[PDB]
């Protein structure tokens, strides 16, 4: 809820970071995307 | 863009001073990056590398001095001790392994495994 453990918060942050799409420039030298409503983190 | 061989000669205090300066520079770069800028965003990496090098040099120096301090004297700090696989450490020294009982030694001395060319 609105009162999380610090560790949990960190995990959430990490997940969020993971979520973001490939920086496009790489493509010139993702399958693991997630949606908060369809696949749960099961934390 | 200072390299290792130039830093080995410098006194520790001087090295420290250099390092602090480098750190300061890095901080500035970071600040710039944070602000809407992309001018010196690629310079930072080099600076970081330099800093790392400096740190390494200083660390090595520190280690050397420590080693000098703790020369012989039976026991030594576990870091300065010859770090090797635990099992190996546990294991008896080759000499120890060899060490036979007195009678056995005598026997060995008396009748060694001689070479006896057979024709």
């Amino acid at each position: 809820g609105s009162i999380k453990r610090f560790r949990l918060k960190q995990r959430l942050g990490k997940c969020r970071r993971q979520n973001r799409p490939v920086p496009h420039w790489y493509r010139l030298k993702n399958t693991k995307r997630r949606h908060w409503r369809r696949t749960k983190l099961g934390l | 863009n200072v390299k290792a061989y130039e830093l080995r000669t410098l006194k520790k205090k001087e090295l420290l001073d250099k390092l602090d300066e480098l750190k300061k520079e890095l901080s500035g770069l970071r600040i710039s990056k944070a602000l809407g800028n992309s001018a010196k965003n690629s310079k930072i990496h080099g600076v970081r590398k330099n800093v790392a090098r400096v740190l390494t040099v200083y660390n090595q120096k520190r280690k050397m001095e420590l080693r000098q301090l703790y020369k012989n004297k039976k026991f030594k700090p576990y870091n300065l001790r010859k770090k090797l696989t635990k099992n190996k450490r546990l294991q008896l020294s080759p000499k120890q392994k060899a060490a036979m009982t007195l009678r056995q030694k005598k026997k060995v001395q008396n009748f060694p495994q001689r070479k006896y060319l057979v024709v």
Partner: protein, 101 residues
């Protein structure tokens, strides 16, 4: 009382524990932060997740001619800390902002 003939471990290496450089990571811009700087003489800094309020204050003191009245901090969901630093009335955050770059 301990009386060790030789100390177990001697980390002769330069301290790993975060100094001022690394404690305080960078000033934050952002419209919010700019507003803060303008209206309430508060400087916003991204800082190490493991920096304490005292520590941050110390860093601030060291990194700039600034004195801090109060420091509020929060953990961002990017795994960084945001420190809201209110400066004492003697200082003008704007001028100090300018100085910082």
């Amino acid at each position: 009382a301990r009386n060790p003939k030789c100390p177990r471990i001697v980390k002769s290496c330069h301290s790993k524990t975060l100094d001022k450089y690394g404690l305080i990571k960078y000033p934050l811009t952002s419209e919010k932060a700019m507003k803060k700087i303008e209206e309430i003489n508060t400087l916003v800094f991204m800082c190490d997740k493991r920096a304490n309020k005292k520590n941050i204050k110390k860093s601030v003191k060291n990194l700039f001619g600034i004195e801090c009245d109060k420091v509020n901090v929060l953990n961002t969901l990017n795994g960084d800390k945001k420190a809201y630093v209110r400066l004492s009335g003697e200082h003008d955050a704007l001028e100090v902002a300018n100085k910082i770059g």
